[PDB]
Design a protein around this ligand. Structure first.
Ligand SMILES: *C/C=C(C)/C=C/C=C(C)/C=C/C1=C(C)CCCC1(C)C
Length: 133
């Protein structure tokens, strides 16, 4: 339940546009992002994670150590500085990103070869489901 290693292919993505709009992503870009197939690759070594979410010309990468606050600059997204922190709440991997936006972060629930990812910003939640390839 705590092993997120692998290559994960998207099965579903709900409220992606509402969450992107809460982050202030350009409206024109949102209409492109909605079309792009996403692949999520996670390398997890103890507390050390490398997360890479990739598409045709738009990627999001983040590396972190569980329990260690880090400065995150969302250079490929909304271009903001947040103080990010990833922790385990039971078997849920929880990220809080402290900064301008309220309720900003993400959570992963790993259920075998399924990964549920919820991205939050403001009053918006984006719900994604991936299957391990
Ligand atoms: C644990 C997994 C996480 C935190 C994955 C996060 C992925 C993203 C924030 C992806 C964002 C993207 C866009 C908003 C537009 C299109 C390109 C993406 C998929 C990289």
């Amino acid at each position: 339940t705590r092993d997120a290693n692998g290559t994960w292919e998207m099965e579903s993505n709900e409220n992606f546009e509402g969450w992107m709009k809460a982050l202030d992503i350009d409206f024109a870009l949102r209409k492109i992002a909605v079309r792009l197939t996403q692949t999520l690759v996670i390398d997890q070594d103890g507390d050390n994670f490398k997360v890479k979410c990739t598409s045709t010309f738009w990627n999001y990468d983040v590396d972190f150590t569980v329990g260690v606050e880090f400065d995150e600059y969302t250079k490929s997204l909304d271009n903001r500085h947040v103080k990010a922190l990833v922790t385990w709440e039971g078997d849920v991997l929880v990220c809080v990103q402290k900064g301008e936006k309220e309720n900003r972060g993400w959570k992963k629930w790993i259920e075998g070869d399924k990964l549920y990812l919820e991205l939050t910003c403001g009053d918006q939640v984006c719900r994604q489901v991936f299957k391990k390839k």
